[PDB]
C-alpha cells in the first residue's frame with residue numbers, strides 16, 4: 001500500500017492534470033515496477049539504476065516504431081514520460097489481452113498455433129526489415145569479462161573459472177555474430193506477447209532492451225526449452241516461416257547466450273552490488289557443470 005501511494009503521488013506531481021483514481025501493481029522486474037492506473041494506463045517506473053539513459057532509449061524506440069511499423073499488432077505508445085538519473089517513468093495505454101504461456105498454447109488447435117506462429121514471424125520480419133541504438137553483444141561480453149577480471153575473478157573457484165574461460169573460448173571461436181544486424185526487440189519471450197480472444201497475437205510489450213543487434217537475437221527465447229517458454233519446435237517453425245535465416249546458427253546463438261546466463265547473473269550482481277546474484281550465478285555454474 002505504501003509503494004502505490006508514493007507512485008500515485010509522483011504521477012500526479014509530474015503529470016499535472018493527471019488524476020489517479022485507481023492504481024495497482026501489475027508487474028515488476030528486478031529493477032523496476034509497473035502499475036495499472038485507472039484500469040486504463042500502464043506506468044513503468046524505475047529509480048536510480050545502472051542504465052541511467054535507459055527509459056530514454058526505450059521511449060525513442062517506441063516513438064520510432066509507432067512512426068514506422070505498419071502492423072495490426074499493438075505496442076506501447078508513450079503518452080507520459082519523465083526521465084532523470086534518479087527516476088524514470090513511462091506511461092502508455094495498457095495493451096489488452098492475455099499473455100502467451102505454454103499452458104495456453106497447448107489448448108490451442110493446430111490451426112490456431114499456426115496462425116500465431118505466422119503472426120510472430122510476420123511481426124519480426126517487418127521489424128527486422130526496417131531501415132534503422134546499436135548493441136554489440138560480443139564486445140559487451142568482453143567488457144563484462146574485463147570487469148570480472150578487475151573484481152572477483154581471482155576469488156572464484158577453479159570450476160567457476162573454467163566455466164567462464166571455456167565460454168570465452170567458445171565466444172572467440174564462434175561466427176554467429178558476423179551476420180545480419182537489424183532492429184530487434186531483444187527480449188522476445190512469451191511473457192511479452194499478448195493474445196486476443198481468438199488466440200491471435202494482438203500486442204507486444206517491453207522493448208526496453210531493444211536495439212540494432214544480430215538478427216538471431218529475436219529467436220533466442222522462441223528456441224528455448226524451459227517451463228516458461230513454449231519449446232524448441234515452436235521457435236524452429238517460426239524460423240521456417242520467417243525465412244532466409246540459418247536455423248543452425250540461430251540455435252548456436254541461443255545455446256551460447258544460454259551458456260552465458262550464469263555469468264551475466266554474476267556480472268549483474270557485481271554492477272548492482274547485489275551479492276545474492278553473484279551467489280546464484282556461481283551456484284548455477286556448478287549445477288550446469290554436473291548435469292550429465
Ligand SMILES: CN[C@@H]1[C@@H](O)[C@@H](O[C@@H]2[C@@H](O)[C@H](O[C@H]3O[C@H]([C@@H](C)NC)CC[C@H]3N)[C@@H](N)C[C@H]2N)OC[C@]1(C)O
Nearest residue numbers: 186187188189190191209221224226228229258261264
Ligand atoms: C535481454 N535481457 C535478458 C533478460 O530480460 C532475461 O530474459 C528472460 C530470461 O532470463 C528467461 O530465461 C532465463 O531464465 C529462465 C528461468 C530461470 N526464468 C525464471 C531459464 C532460461 C534462462 N535463459 C526467459 N525465459 C525470459 C526472458 N525474457 O534474461 C536473459 C537476459 C539476457 O538477461
Ligand SMILES: Nc1nc2c(ncn2[C@@H]2O[C@H](COP(=O)(O)OP(=O)(O)O)[C@@H](O)[C@H]2O)c(=O)[nH]1
Nearest residue numbers: 026027028029032034042094095096205206208
Ligand atoms: N497486459 C499488459 N501488461 C503489461 C503491459 N505493460 C506492462 N505489463 C505487465 O507488467 C510488466 C511490464 O514490465 P515490462 O514492460 O516487461 O518492463 P521490464 O521491466 O523491462 O520487464 C509485464 O511483464 C506485464 O506483466 C501492457 O501494456 N499490457
Ligand SMILES: [Cl-]
Nearest residue numbers: 275278279282
Ligand atoms: Cl558469492
Ligand SMILES: [Mg+2]
Nearest residue numbers: 029187192206
Ligand atoms: Mg519485461
